[PDB]
């Protein structure tokens, strides 16, 4: 069947075969590339009979394979949330592991890998890096001393290929180290969880813990504060608080933030200004074209910071 | 035989497209019932 | 063994062997500290493996989602059952390594019999003035 | 059947699958997410036959599962009262327990858990907290010393994931501690019961006990006094007392309080003022739109406080 598949791929065309290979596994792609150029057999009847049998064998491949991962990702996103969808997708991806330990090295935490391969010879480090995922390798070099970082980067630039025996030896060595080791450190509770925990305790303890965190690190405290009140609880803000905050919100920034906001939030926020102002805002939103989320997120962050400052001052409330 | 297979495929792709529409109305009517039935199917699969 | 367990890179520096009376060793130890009575059969007696609060704190921190960012704080806090299990897991590797090291010269089997937290519970020396190798 | 369910979920859509997963158990959701993206099989006949059999197997799932918990909650609320409905719902929820001891820790009282895990290593405390329900964890940290509170919060912010072996070890340890321990402290008799007990004894003993409680803690005494006379016995107040209290009740506050009151209470309270005043109050109530219960409760509390002050002075009676 492989020879027939190779013949069909060759007869299909360069673009279709390239797309199929991009949608095919490494071993399958290599076998198809080798066999097609190696020996190609065309049969007046047997090939046609095999093609007809393949085309009639099942209709299952056309649908399930058309959309499998995208549907699962959309379901995970819509089910619980973006944060839980990321964890579910990570678990699903980790369900399919890698045999050779070199690839298993990129599922490890960057510092664990950096500690594991710091003492190795610089060329061996370099060999691991080009086999390792680029993102991971960059993090590893970031954790590496500057001298070792420069040396390994230079080795990466002028790499000259490994002997198969040495590569196999490194593979088997690395396998004996990672296959025994547990390779799925479960991370439960980051800053979203910390913010949720903080939001449910007393105000005095809330301010004590946030100021303690700020003393430890200001960036972590600000991230906790931002995760504390997301751009979705504004619907629960009082009308008087919304009207008070409207006096310090720029019309352009507010429109940019509310362009991607929920219609209910826009309706709630449009009841605090004048009728003419509400009509002007609605017309501007209708006339505003699609924009990148990078600027809308910044505008929403500025609006939330202003609202939080007003609330901290004591000129806003919720309900 | 090819024409009969094509007609059967068209009927399958029409009634399934109708079936997909049918399963959406029912799930919108009762979302938890579908999940309960799925869980019962998994329990019976054991 | 520590690399295999903690998924990190430790460096162990061997200090000078100290031949001292037992009460010197006892008094230099901090309180509380995990003590692991071990039997080095067929040698009659009972040796001791002493894990410092700092080391067990580091191990527990690394195992339970900690990059050792915060400084280690020890204020006489005792060891819970989870900490005791972590120490048992570490001590299994420690005893295996010690037995393998002794295997080269004299084949000995190392058995862990008991763990304690205070110093007055061990008394592996008939008298406090007995001489021990640390 | 699981593969067929996964195929049906994939063919349904992202939103429907997300809703089903949100209405599905954790293990079932994980299995469905894994299987759908893992291997998907479509059958021209077998899948259709299975779908038809599932659709025709029973009509029971559509009704009972449509409304099971909401109906039980409504029945409990309407049967005895809000206070008894809460206890019944708590018992029903506690009927379904948790296997792993970490989740069993959030059914324990906050102080018992705080005492249990205070001596543990701060990282282990942090690991327990992200696995524990957020509300409980907040209470636990509130009971925790400020130094330990800040340390554990910092660990929560920068959590980095646990090794599966360590998590399993903590799970089994925590199980051995809580599974043996009884985990359902029955709480019978709070302040509602204390107020009911007080209301049925002699006036001299009533004042003695309330002043003793006030000496112990003023907030508890005020809560007892408020639970003493709820906003439902006003129908038993005398007409003369109602007329006397009407002289000190604001029209807006009275209307806000009576907006959600029983029609019988409004009719009884409308017989003490003038006919024009009663008509004006009725027109205002009819024209008043729905409002949040937070302000109506405050208005009713103010009215009840005024009535209680009038009665204590000696210018009101009941009947």
- Alpha carbon distance B35, B41 (integer Å): 10
Burial class for D122, CB neighbours closer than 10 Å (0-12, 13-18, 19+): buried
- Alpha carbon distance D307, A165 (integer Å): 94
The pairing of strands C34-41 and C47-51 is antiparallel
- Alpha carbon distance D60, A13 (integer Å): 54
Of the candidates D157, D173, D45, D22, the one whose C-alpha atom is nearest the C-alpha of residue D100 is D173
- Structural contact between residues D184 and D109, judged by C-beta atoms closer than 8 angstroms: no
- Structural contact between residues D121 and D169, judged by C-beta atoms closer than 8 angstroms: no
**CB count in 10 Å sphere of residue B2:** 8
D170-203 in b/e form (b: 16+ CB < 10 A) is: bbebbeeebeeeebeeeeeeeeeebbeebeeeee
Q: What are C20's strand-pairing partners?
A: C132
**CB count in 10 Å sphere of residue D224:** 19
The alpha carbon of residue A97 is apart from the nearest alpha carbon of chain C, in Å, by 19
Token couple for A203: 């105000």
Please compute Rg for chain C using Cα positions.
Answer: 16
The alpha carbon of residue A285 is apart from the nearest alpha carbon of chain D, in Å, by 27
Q: DSSP letter at C42?
A: T
Query: Three-state DSSP class for D188?
Result: coil
Dihedrals phi, psi of C112, to nearest 5 degrees: -90, 120
Please compute Rg for chain B using Cα positions.
Answer: 16
Direct distance between the N- and C-terminal alpha carbons of chain D, in angstroms, rounded to an integer: 67
Of the candidates D117, C75, D146, the one whose C-alpha atom is nearest the C-alpha of residue A213 is D146
Q: What are A318's strand-pairing partners?
A: A237
- Alpha carbon distance D133, D3 (integer Å): 33
Of the candidates A197, A295, A191, the one whose C-alpha atom is nearest the C-alpha of residue A253 is A295
Query: Three-state DSSP class for A69?
Result: helix
**Angle at alpha carbon of residue D161, lines to D157 and D163, rounded to 5°:** 150
Query: Any residues with CB less than 8 A from the CB of D161 and at least 6 apart, and which?
Result: A109, A185, A186, A187, A188, C65
- Alpha carbon distance A206, A195 (integer Å): 10
Query: Three-state DSSP class for C111?
Result: strand
Query: Three-state DSSP class for C124?
Result: coil
CA distances, D86 to each of A33, D67, D260 (Å): 68, 19, 22
> Which method was used?
cryo-EM
CB contacts of A56 in chain B (<8 Å) are 5
- Alpha carbon distance C36, C46 (integer Å): 10
The answer to whether the Cβ–Cβ distance between C3 and A116 falls below 8 Å is: yes
- Alpha carbon distance A37, A34 (integer Å): 6
Query: Three-state DSSP class for A120?
Result: coil
- Alpha carbon distance D150, C103 (integer Å): 48
Query: Any residues with CB less than 8 A from the CB of D129 and at least 6 apart, and which?
Result: A189, A193, A197, D137, D140, D141, D152, D156
CA distances, D144 to each of A194, A205, A217, A221, D112 (Å): 16, 11, 22, 20, 12
Give me the residues of D, 162-221, that contact A with CB < 8 A: 162-165, 167
Token couple for D266: 């409004």
Determine the number of helices (DSSP H) and then strands (DSSP E) in chain D: 21, 0
**Angle at alpha carbon of residue A215, lines to A214 and A218, rounded to 5°:** 40
Element (H, E) at C93: helix C81-103
Dihedrals phi, psi of C43, to nearest 5 degrees: -70, 125
Element (H, E) at C36: strand C34-41
Count CA within 13 A, CB hemisphere, residue D207.
Answer: 3
Please compute Rg for chain D using Cα positions.
Answer: 29
- Alpha carbon distance D178, D181 (integer Å): 5
Q: Quick one: CA dihedral C60, C65, C71, C76, positive or negative?
A: negative
- Alpha carbon distance C101, C94 (integer Å): 11
Q: What is the dihedral of CA A248, A254, A257, A261, to 10 degrees?
A: 110
Q: What are C38's strand-pairing partners?
A: C47, C112
- Alpha carbon distance D18, D14 (integer Å): 6
- Structural contact between residues D235 and D272, judged by C-beta atoms closer than 8 angstroms: no
Q: DSSP letter at C130?
A: -
- Structural contact between residues B25 and D58, judged by C-beta atoms closer than 8 angstroms: no
CA A204 to chain centre: 37
Ordered strands of the C109-116 beta sheet: C47-51, C34-41, C109-116
**CB count in 10 Å sphere of residue A100:** 17
- Alpha carbon distance D20, A71 (integer Å): 13
Q: What are C41's strand-pairing partners?
A: C109
**CB count in 10 Å sphere of residue D99:** 10
- Structural contact between residues D266 and D306, judged by C-beta atoms closer than 8 angstroms: no
The alpha carbon of residue D301 is apart from the nearest alpha carbon of chain C, in Å, by 50
H/E/C letters for each residue in D209-238?
HHHHHHHHCHHHHHHHHHHHCCCCHHHHEC
**CB count in 10 Å sphere of residue A139:** 17
Q: What is the DSSP string of A294-316?
A: HHHHHHHHHHHHHHHHHHHHTS-
Token couple for D76: 């409990």
- Structural contact between residues D159 and C65, judged by C-beta atoms closer than 8 angstroms: yes
CA A138 to chain centre: 17
CA distances, D187 to each of A52, A288, D38, D115, D139 (Å): 74, 58, 49, 20, 18
- Alpha carbon distance A296, D9 (integer Å): 34
Burial class for D100, CB neighbours closer than 10 Å (0-12, 13-18, 19+): middle
Element (H, E) at C50: strand C47-51
**CB count in 10 Å sphere of residue D128:** 24
- Structural contact between residues A111 and A143, judged by C-beta atoms closer than 8 angstroms: yes
Chain D touches chain A, with at least 3 Cβ pairs below 8 Å, answer: yes
- Structural contact between residues D183 and D108, judged by C-beta atoms closer than 8 angstroms: yes
Please tell me which residue of chain D has the smallest CA distance to A68.
Answer: D37
- Partner D contacted by A138 (CB < 8 A): no
The pairing of strands C109-116 and C131-133 is unpaired
Chains that touch A (3 or more CB pairs under 8 A): B, C, D
Query: Any residues with CB less than 8 A from the CB of A148 and at least 6 apart, and which?
Result: A118, A122, A125
- Alpha carbon distance A180, A169 (integer Å): 17
**CB count in 10 Å sphere of residue A149:** 14
Count CA within 13 A, CB hemisphere, residue A57.
Answer: 9
Q: DSSP letter at C71?
A: P
Helix, strand, coil share of chain C (percent; to 5): 35, 20, 45
CA distances, D28 to each of A116, A133, B36, D102, D227 (Å): 37, 32, 10, 21, 45
Of the candidates D170, D108, D115, the one whose C-alpha atom is nearest the C-alpha of residue D144 is D115
- Alpha carbon distance A106, A102 (integer Å): 8
- Partner C contacted by A193 (CB < 8 A): no
Of the candidates A178, A132, A103, C67, the one whose C-alpha atom is nearest the C-alpha of residue D161 is C67
Check residue C79 and give left, alpha or beta (phi > 0: left; psi -120 to 50: alpha): beta
- Alpha carbon distance D167, D182 (integer Å): 24
Per DSSP, which regions of chain A are E strands? Answer: none
- Alpha carbon distance A141, A138 (integer Å): 5
In chain B, what is the greatest distance between 2 CA atoms, to the nearest angstrom? 44
- Partner D contacted by A25 (CB < 8 A): no
Query: Any residues with CB less than 8 A from the CB of D10 and at least 6 apart, and which?
Result: A64, A67, A68, A71, A72, D17, D36, D40
- Partner C contacted by A298 (CB < 8 A): no
- Alpha carbon distance D272, A149 (integer Å): 89
Token couple for A192: 């979203």
- Alpha carbon distance D264, D98 (integer Å): 47
Provide long-range contacts, Cβ within 8 A and 24+ apart, for A199-203.
Answer: A199/A228, A199/D138, A200/D134, A200/D135, A200/D138, A201/D138, A201/D139, A201/D141, A201/D142, A202/D142
- Alpha carbon distance A298, A306 (integer Å): 12
Element (H, E) at D261: none
C43-81 in b/e form (b: 16+ CB < 10 A) is: eeeeebbebebebbbbbbbbbbbbeeeeeeeeeeeebbe
- Alpha carbon distance C63, D174 (integer Å): 17
Check residue D22 and give left, alpha or beta (phi > 0: left; psi -120 to 50: alpha): alpha
**CB count in 10 Å sphere of residue A250:** 13
Resolution, rounded to a tenth of an Å? 3.0
Query: Three-state DSSP class for D184?
Result: coil
Token couple for A112: 């664990």
- Alpha carbon distance C46, C40 (integer Å): 7
Give me the residues of D, 30-69, that contact B with CB < 8 A: 31-32, 44, 48, 51, 54, 57, 61-62, 65-66
The answer to whether the Cβ–Cβ distance between C65 and A118 falls below 8 Å is: no
**CB count in 10 Å sphere of residue D5:** 25
Q: DSSP letter at C40?
A: E
Query: Any residues with CB less than 8 A from the CB of C87 and at least 6 apart, and which?
Result: C34, C36, C51, C56, C59, C79, C115
Token couple for A217: 């690190």
Query: Three-state DSSP class for A66?
Result: coil
- Structural contact between residues C29 and C119, judged by C-beta atoms closer than 8 angstroms: yes
- Alpha carbon distance A115, A131 (integer Å): 18
Q: What is the DSSP string of D152-170?
A: HHHHHHT---B-HHHHHHH
Query: Three-state DSSP class for D122?
Result: helix
- Structural contact between residues A127 and A156, judged by C-beta atoms closer than 8 angstroms: no
- Partner B contacted by D310 (CB < 8 A): no
Q: What is the DSSP string of D36-95?
A: HHH-----TTHHHHHHHHHHHH-SHHHHHTTSSHHHHHHHHHHHT-HHHHHHHHHHHHHH
Dihedrals phi, psi of C35, to nearest 5 degrees: -110, 135
- Partner D contacted by A38 (CB < 8 A): no
Instruction: Using CB atoms, pick whichever of B12, B34, B40 lies closest to residue D20.
Output: B34
Q: Quick one: CA dihedral A46, A49, A51, A57, positive or negative?
A: negative
Query: Any residues with CB less than 8 A from the CB of D298 and at least 6 apart, and which?
Result: none
Q: Quick one: CA dihedral A260, A262, A267, A273, positive or negative?
A: negative
- Alpha carbon distance A71, D33 (integer Å): 10
CA A306 to chain centre: 30
The pairing of strands C109-116 and C19-21 is unpaired
Total beta-carbon pairs less than 8 A apart between chain A and chain C: 22
């Amino acid at each position: 069947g492989t020879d027939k598949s190779v013949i069909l791929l060759m007869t299909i065309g360069e673009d279709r075969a390239a797309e199929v290979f991009k949608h095919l596994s490494t071993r399958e792609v290599q076998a198809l590339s080798t066999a097609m150029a190696n020996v190609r057999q065309i049969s007046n009847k047997q090939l046609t009979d095999v093609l007809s049998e393949f085309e009639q064998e099942a209709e299952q491949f056309a649908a399930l394979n058309i959309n499998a991962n995208e549907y699962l990702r959309s379901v995970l996103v819509k089910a619980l949330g973006e944060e839980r969808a990321s964890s579910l997708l990570e678990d699903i991806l980790e369900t399919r592991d890698t045999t050779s330990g070199i690839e298993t090295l990129n599922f490890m935490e960057p510092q664990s890998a950096a500690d594991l391969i710091r003492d190795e010879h610089p060329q061996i480090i370099a060999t691991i890096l080009v086999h390792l995922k680029r993102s991971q390798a960059a993090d590893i070099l970031a954790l590496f001393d500057e001298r070792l970082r420069h040396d390994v980067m230079l080795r990466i630039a002028t790499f000259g290929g490994v002997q198969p025996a040495a590569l196999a030896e490194l593979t088997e060595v690395l396998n004996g180290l990672l296959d025994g080791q547990n390779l799925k450190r479960s991370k439960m509770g980051g800053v979203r969880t910390a913010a949720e925990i903080i939001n449910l305790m007393k105000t005095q303890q809330e301010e004590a813990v946030i100021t303690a965190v700020r003393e430890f690190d200001g960036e972590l405290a600000q991230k906790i504060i931002d995760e504390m009140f997301l751009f979705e609880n504004l619907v629960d803000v009082d009308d008087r608080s919304i009207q008070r905050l409207l006096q310090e919100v720029d019309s352009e920034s507010l429109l940019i933030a509310l362009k991607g906001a929920e219609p209910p939030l826009r309706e709630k926020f449009l009841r605090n200004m004048s009728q003419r102002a509400a009509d002007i805002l609605r017309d501007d939103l209708a006339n505003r074209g699609p924009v990148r989320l990078s600027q809308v997120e910044n505008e929403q962050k500025a609006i939330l910071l202003i609202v939080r400052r007003l609330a901290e001052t004591g000129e806003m409330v919720i309900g | 035989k090819d024409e009969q297979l094509q007609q059967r495929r068209a009927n399958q792709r029409l009634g399934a497209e109708v079936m997909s529409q049918r399963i959406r109305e029912m799930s919108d009517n009762d979302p938890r019932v579908v999940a309960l039935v799925i869980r019962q199917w998994m329990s019976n699969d054991h | 063994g520590l690399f295999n367990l903690l998924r990190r890179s430790p460096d162990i520096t061997v200090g000078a062997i100290r031949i001292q009376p037992y009460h010197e060793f006892a008094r230099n130890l901090p309180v509380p500290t995990n003590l692991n009575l071990i039997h080095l059969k067929p040698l009659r007696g009972t040796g001791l493996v002493v894990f410092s609060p700092s080391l067990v704190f580091i191990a527990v921190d690394n195992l339970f989602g900690g990059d050792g960012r915060f400084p280690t704080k020890v204020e006489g806090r005792e060891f819970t059952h989870t900490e005791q299990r972590v120490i048992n897991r570490m001590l299994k590797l420690a005893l295996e390594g010690y037995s393998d090291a002794w295997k080269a010269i004299n084949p000995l089997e190392v058995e862990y019999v008991r763990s304690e937290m205070q110093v007055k519970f061990t008394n592996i020396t008939t008298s406090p003035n007995d001489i021990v190798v640390n």
